[PDB]
Design a protein around this ligand. Structure first.
Ligand SMILES: CC(C)(C)c1cc(O)ccc1O
Ligand SMILES: CC(C)(C)c1cc(O)ccc1O
Ligand SMILES: CC(C)(C)c1cc(O)ccc1O
Lengths: 319, 172, 319, 172, 319, 172
């Protein structure tokens, strides 16, 4: 018998299966899971600045609807809209609603820059029983419902604001579509109204349309919400013969800013995570995740697979 | 594996090697013993760690994106927004599948390679003093006490000391 | 001479060229083609449920135009539109036509839920010589052409339907733009019409515009087709002072359903394939295909390459 | 190939090996013959089959998508729908090109590897009884009748039986 | 001492670092950079046909605004719009402006097919002090400003052109929105205008809206620009009761043609490059580039990395 | 590297090998010298050149695309156009990163492989006339003048001429 010396390697009792280019099931000593499958079940309020809309969606928030007052001057990285949000004010619709939501979400702020306006020849601060605040008739806090003056006419409206500042302004305004001709004349004298809002470079003109619409909060008429941007240097004119829902000022557009809105259900926790999904927060170093394709922040990329094991050891050959 | 050393001419691994990935098991006039090889274990661990840190360089940070769920049919724009997202998810799912498969192919070949480099290293230290037994073992054709075994393990073994003895045993 | 033993491998006379990371042309013993290049030249009617529009496109089908009656109650995975399809009825246009086609294609059904309506103060079932059925004046089978009553006025229309059901309804309706003022008054008394269709949450109002348009099937006027969705619980109102092309009921929206439309030329065969293209069906296990980027069903992914050979054997070295 | 056995120190392949991928061709006192090696052939076929089944896991099933051809210019939306699709097709064309290239690189190395593992296996069975000739052949330094040849091929050859004869021939 | 023979490989003093799957920094003998980082700082006029808008953007060019006359009959692979471009004519806006720019850019031509029209009952060739050419009142060279006739009325306009040719025509036309009722009647007699432009298959009708808009070049009114395509065989009708800004002919649509517009700052050089970016031209064989995601022609693909070194030699081990 | 020849059992490279990638350095009764091996150098250069030409097949040519910068907020469509482009850029950045990494992994293994094939080639030419020293060198156990050295380098060395001399020296 001569001495022998053998070279070998380690082997554990229980290996882990990985895939390779040629094999579905190959047992190795150790492996790491690359697909994150777990989330927190609460939204973490840090490091991202969250604002919870609770019962207002972002637009009701921007218009100043009754449930929304706590959202004034709010600023966010991510605004959270709740599936429990409800309309509380005069029924309205927004042509290209989605784009207004997108533009608001993106600017990241509900801090209103209030403005003095002189609306000549009309009653101001119109209120409605479809918009109750503390049990009393009220309206969108950011809008001004004008009607005809005590003595008669809707003195033609023609008011202008110059953008003196260094930021792009966003102006929110509306048109009232009444349910009858009685109501049209009762409110605006003129049989047929007109609202024209314009800058040096863009313009919108709306003739309101009468008729009965299903009753909401007892109301058959509607307000259509429009918006106009105004660059530094430009001006905006509000020209109306009737039916103008007037602005009380404007919002500041900070463009291309890391801000957004997340439609989620989960409560805001006290955890810390740089990654929010509609399903909860992800706390993970894994390159991939399957929790949700709605992922905001520093997140693993969404993939379909529920598992991808990376081998981190040699073939496991016990026995 | 490309080298046929792990799951190859090394029949199996040692469950008792708990302090290394690769090692020496010997038999001599004084008995038997197992020790870990540090260089070969370290070379494998470094390469695996290297490829793991590589998989972290984290460059996925997105805020305002597009909507991904919808409350109502719309037609044209919605079709596009969904097609865009579905196209994106398929391509990333494909990237991750291939990345893992090919990474695993490679790691297994690397680990098999490092086993083989250890075998080859010792083959070269022993010169004409030993013969390959076919199973990851060398028959050493001279007395080799514990100090001599350790000199093989730490790469100070000088084959010339044992050469005449070994070559003589090799030949009857 | 001592005995020898040699290790070797196989070699065939005619190899196949593959590509690798370093070589364009490498000859191996065997290889498989991964890009599918062939199709059937007929569309296979299984396993996917096909419906052939023949001479109606999907919208003429939905409106009930004369060539379209055989498409009633039809349901599909894939609706086939033919390049031979023709308009057979009063000339019309559809604002955002594509989205209506998309919405229809997707719901996968032409089964109309008919509804009793009471249109008060108007003549009903208007017909036209631009829409002939069996040689006789007719109209879109799903629409109701209202005009002024024998004795005079177009008694104001205001009709409402409540969505009592559990599915979203799609209502197809129109506005008639007349070629002259003679014709306007002749049909609707009123000098200027108005059609307003609305729910609790959305609304459209159209004032029709008069004027001469090129003659189609002898007709210079047009109908504009609009559509309104109505959720479970909501209501729709049809309010018109004139020019309403009224619905006869609604379609059911099954949303997010594996249904679509394919613009194709090929006849429907009797073959079996889970993959349809505009060029024919693909019957293949190949991962890739170049036949067409229009591919519906379980299909190889479209790629630009006409060939990708996967090696399935070793280097071929004869001689 | 990474191993230099196929298209390497094995000059060429055998067109007459019609029942295996790898084999033995011998010469002894009784004549000559070719037989297939089953283990090495099976190891290569399994790996190739493995990678082929892998390429089928079929996850491409799409219904309503977007329009991909257009009857009339429209501008903005159409540009996007085409850019989306063209972006998608380029990325998949790229995936398929790379997948095949790297798969083929690998297969060729695998097949070359398996050739080499066979060579190495036999090298180990023969010990000091044979010398590598440089061309995939071993010169065997003792008489080796058909039974002996077969014992090499089926891995029961015991080198100790022939050792004194072989070592003696090796040395004059 | 016996002779020895050693096998070895080369080694240079200064290696280059590459990355591999397992290592960030691995020194090899030689390497090639795969990401192009440099550009020319002038746009190369070959092999791609460039047209420099200088002070006209593409649309002012298409309308025939005063600075634009040198762009007549111009044709391009790439039209260059300059950030110094300015409006020089009556203030206008274009609903879906972007799509008109896209359609023009794509057709690759500003060669106008002029047409004789008979506008009956109106004054023609209206001019404006907001559109000066050589110090004199003028208008868009491709448009025809019609007003009421010396003696009175705006004889109703109804003119038709048949597409006799084999190419799709693009017609550019407008609607004048006046600043007051004085001006409305002064120009078009009628209190409220109407412009309806239509083919067999599509149609647009606009009622102009009055009101004050911020003054541009002293002018408070606006022209809205619209466009209508006309297939071989089809016809177009221009029907107006007032406020029509009439076409003088049409542009030819060559569709699906390698043509586009680049918003750039750089001067046109005399270099040669098949790849233009907004930042300059790329002259490179590198597969990748980081210069800009705006890349037109035969270009390296844009990537985020500033460097990717491909190894082209073995490990470098000196000493 | 997978083979452990470059940055492995070859301690380092030769800065003076200026006319090849791989070579022979010898020592004999007449002195010392270095020469380049053409086959092994050519095999490596060909493979690297192959993979470089492969990376040029140029298929990126785009004209009218979509807008990629914007003068004013718009919401929905703009979000999509940016998301589309950002998705595209991420996927290509990923492709390029992986392509280079895996290409470099491979090239380094190829170059290491070719070093090893050269070593193995010479090992086979020398048969029982030389012993592996462990450092990429063979000790040759007979006189080998310049012509003999060159016969090794050009693959005409016939081991049978020197066999009795060498085998005798090997054994005392
Ligand atoms: C890893 C491989 C290319 C085989 C693959 C398989 C699969 O089912 C999905 C994606 C893949 O990359
Ligand atoms: C396989 C390789 C990366 C070289 C490649 C070449 C090519 O012309 C197109 C796509 C590719 O992946
Ligand atoms: C090469 C690797 C897969 C590790 C990678 C790392 C990275 O940070 C980005 C992209 C990659 O492909």
């Amino acid at each position: 018998g001569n001495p022998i010396i053998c070279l070998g390697h380690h082997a554990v009792e229980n290996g882990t299966s990985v895939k390779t280019l040629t094999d579905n099931h190959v047992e190795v000593v150790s492996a790491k899971e690359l697909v994150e499958t777990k989330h927190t079940d609460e939204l973490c309020p840090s490091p991202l600045k969250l604002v919870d809309g609770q019962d207002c969606d972002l637009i009701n928030g921007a218009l100043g609807s009754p449930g929304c007052d706590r959202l004034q001057d709010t600023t966010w990285d991510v605004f959270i809209e709740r599936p429990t949000a409800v309309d509380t004010c005069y029924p309205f619709d927004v042509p290209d609603y989605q784009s207004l939501r997108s533009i608001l979400a993106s600017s990241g702020s509900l801090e209103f820059i209030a403005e003095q306006f002189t609306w000549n020849g009309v009653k101001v601060d119109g209120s409605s029983s479809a918009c109750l605040r503390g049990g009393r008739n009220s309206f969108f806090s950011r809008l001004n419902w004008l009607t005809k003056a005590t003595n008669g006419n809707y003195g033609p409206i023609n008011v202008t604001k110059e953008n003196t500042g260094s930021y792009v302004r966003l102006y929110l305004w509306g048109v009232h579509h009444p349910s009858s001709d009685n109501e049209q004349t009762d409110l605006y004298k003129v049989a047929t109204g007109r609202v024209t809002v314009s800058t040096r470079s863009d313009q919108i003109s709306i003739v309101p349309n009468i008729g009965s619409r299903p009753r909401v909060r007892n109301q058959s008429g509607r307000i259509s919400i429009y918006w106009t941007l105004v660059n530094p240097g430009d001006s905006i004119i509000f020209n109306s013969i009737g039916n103008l829902i007037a602005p009380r000022g404007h919002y500041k557009i900070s463009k291309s800013t890391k801000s957004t809105v997340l439609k989620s259900d989960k409560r805001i926790g006290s955890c810390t995570s740089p990654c929010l999904t509609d399903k909860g927060s992800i706390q993970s170093d894994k390159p991939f995740q399957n929790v949700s394709r709605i992922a905001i922040g520093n997140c693993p990329k969404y993939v379909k697979q529920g598992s991808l094991m990376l081998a981190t050891g040699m073939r496991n050959i016990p026995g | 594996g490309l080298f046929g050393a792990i799951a190859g001419f090394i029949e199996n691994g040692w469950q008792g090697l708990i302090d290394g990935w690769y090692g020496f098991r010997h038999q001599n006039a004084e008995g038997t013993g197992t020790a870990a090889d540090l260089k070969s274990t370290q070379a494998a661990i470094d390469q695996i760690n290297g490829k793991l840190n590589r998989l972290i360089e984290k460059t996925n940070e997105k805020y305002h994106q597009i909507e991904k769920e919808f409350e109502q049919v719309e037609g044209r724009i919605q079709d596009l927004e969904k097609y865009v997202e579905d196209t994106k998810i398929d391509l990333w799912s494909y990237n991750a599948e291939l990345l893992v498969a090919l990474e695993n192919q490679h790691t297994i070949d690397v680990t098999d390679s490092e086993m083989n480099k250890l075998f080859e290293r010792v083959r070269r230290q022993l010169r004409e003093n030993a013969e390959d037994q076919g199973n990851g073992c060398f028959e050493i054709f001279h007395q080799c006490d514990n100090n001599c075994i350790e000199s093989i393990r730490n790469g100070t073994y000088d084959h010339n000391i044992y050469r005449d003895e070994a070559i003589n045993n090799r030949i009857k």
